[PDB]
């Protein structure tokens, strides 16, 4: 089961470039990168020693989606390895940024609970909360319209250490196409 | 002069 990660990261701003590296401790002679969804495609690469570097071209919404990386040896028969962990590559910066706020406040005593909320006037179906030092985002559906805003809560539980958080909105039929980042919010533990 | 603003559908 190969390792598949994005460099510098899986959140790619419109028109920028990202490298999907495929990595494995056992030598493979061949690497395949499959994107699934509505724009399915497989890129082939040989690699070296052993790893491969797939370049994903100036980001547009048809390049966003879930990627899995396979390995094999050799060509016929294509002895295909186990699929890698999925890697979702996301295009950001396409719509108005939501607001992000902390309750009770963005600074809190150690062990007190914290809830971050994402809000917008726009009708996003879902929100995505990312923390600076983590590769995955927490996600959660938006409520129905309340006082003309659409909102989701991420309760975080008791606070240990800080976090710089950012919040993104998106629509059901295009879950890898995300709005601009909310203003970053710093959560401090006193 | 044509429009500079555009948005995915």
């Amino acid at each position: 089961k190969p390792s598949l990660l994005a460099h510098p990261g899986p959140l790619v701003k419109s028109e920028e470039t990202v490298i999907l590296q495929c990595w494995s401790d056992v030598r493979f002679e061949h690497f395949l990168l499959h994107r699934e969804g509505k724009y399915k495609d497989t890129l082939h690469l040989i690699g070296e020693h052993s790893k491969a570097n797939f370049s994903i071209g100036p980001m547009m919404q048809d390049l966003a989606g879930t990627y899995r990386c396979y390995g094999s040896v050799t060509h016929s028969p294509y002895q295909l390895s186990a699929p890698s962990d999925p890697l979702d590559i996301v295009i950001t910066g396409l719509y108005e940024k939501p607001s992000l706020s902390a309750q009770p406040g963005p600074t809190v005593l150690a062990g007190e609970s914290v809830t971050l909320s994402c809000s917008s006037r726009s009708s996003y179906d879902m929100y995505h909360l990312s923390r600076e030092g983590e590769a995955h985002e927490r996600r959660f559906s938006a409520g129905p319209k309340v006082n003309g805003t659409f909102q989701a809560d991420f309760p975080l539980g008791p606070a240990t250490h800080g976090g710089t958080y950012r919040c993104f909105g998106s629509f059901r039929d295009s879950p890898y196409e995300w709005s601009n980042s909310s203003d970053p919010l710093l959560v401090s533990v006193t | 002069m044509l429009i500079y603003s555009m948005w995915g559908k």
Binding site: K38, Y39, M60, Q61, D62, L94, Y95, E96, S120, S122, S123, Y124, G169, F171, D173, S174, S179 | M1, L2, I3, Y4, S5, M6, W7, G8, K9
Partner: protein, 274 residues
């Protein structure tokens, strides 16, 4: 009278045969002045009227850049709309976009508009107040929410009331010699026997600009709506327009028939009589 600026975009998917065909053109009134073709050689936005050639390299760089960005957006929107309607990747599909603005004779903004189509049908359009969109169907409703979130309406409205009008007026001044020309039709009549109880009488309008024109046949001062053949106005190739109107008459009642020609380049409407 009024004037207008209008841009037209067409993108056509060509499954297997490379990426989509993109064509963009710009008109002031009935005169074309710029174009872009993705299949053309230069890969530049190109001039099509002499009065626009006076714009410098910075103009042509901006226009080229923006149109190519537009072509990419169109390309990916072809993918998105194919998904919305669950269509196969084998067939050809088409996106059309028209937008522009009108000014009155006093040079004030009269209106603007933007309408988009998919496969020849209304897809999504800007309402007449320029603040919201009308979606033709459920797929376009998804586009509507994206566009509200992207502030698309505000940006079209700013464009339509701002640089559209400013550049249209700039262009009218720079190209006033041709764009503001009164070019009345040369008119003449033809007369051909069809049998020995009837003859055709065809009223001709040539060399006129703009294309808005009215040709009507009367008989003893009454209109001859039902029995009159007339052709759609047509380009002559040189920037001018043609149109004719024909009526079959008994021999020789020719004198009773009258062709009426209305065009803004004419001091007064003509009456032609054989």
């Amino acid at each position: 009278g009024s004037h207008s600026m209008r841009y037209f975009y067409t993108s056509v998917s060509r499954p297997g045969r490379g990426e989509p065909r993109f064509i963009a053109v710009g008109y002031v009134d009935d005169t074309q002045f710029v174009r872009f073709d993705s299949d053309a050689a230069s890969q530049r936005m190109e001039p099509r009227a002499p009065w626009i050639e006076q714009e410098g390299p910075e103009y042509w760089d901006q226009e080229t850049r923006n149109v190519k960005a537009q072509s990419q957006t169109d390309r990916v929107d072809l993918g998105t709309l194919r998904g919305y309607y669950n269509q196969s990747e084998d067939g050809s599909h088409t996106i059309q976009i028209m937008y522009g603005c009108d000014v009155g004779p006093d040079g004030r903004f009269l209106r603007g508009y933007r309408q988009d189509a998919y496969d020849g049908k209304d897809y999504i359009a800007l309402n007449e107040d320029l603040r919201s969109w009308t979606a033709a169907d459920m797929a376009a409703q998804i586009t509507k929410r994206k566009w509200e979130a992207a502030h698309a309406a505000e940006q079209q409205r700013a464009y339509l009331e701002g640089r559209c009008v400013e550049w249209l007026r700039r262009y009218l001044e720079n190209g006033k010699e041709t764009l503001q020309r009164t070019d009345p039709p040369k008119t003449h009549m033809t007369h051909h026997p069809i049998s020995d109880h009837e003859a055709t009488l065809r009223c001709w309008a040539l060399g006129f600009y703009p294309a808005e024109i009215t040709l009507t046949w009367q008989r003893d001062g009454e209109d001859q709506t039902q029995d009159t053949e007339l052709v759609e106005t047509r380009p002559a190739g040189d920037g001018t327009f043609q149109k004719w109107a024909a009526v079959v008459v008994p021999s020789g009642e020719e004198q009773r028939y009258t062709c009426h020609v209305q065009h803004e380049g004419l001091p007064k409407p003509l009456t032609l009589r054989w």
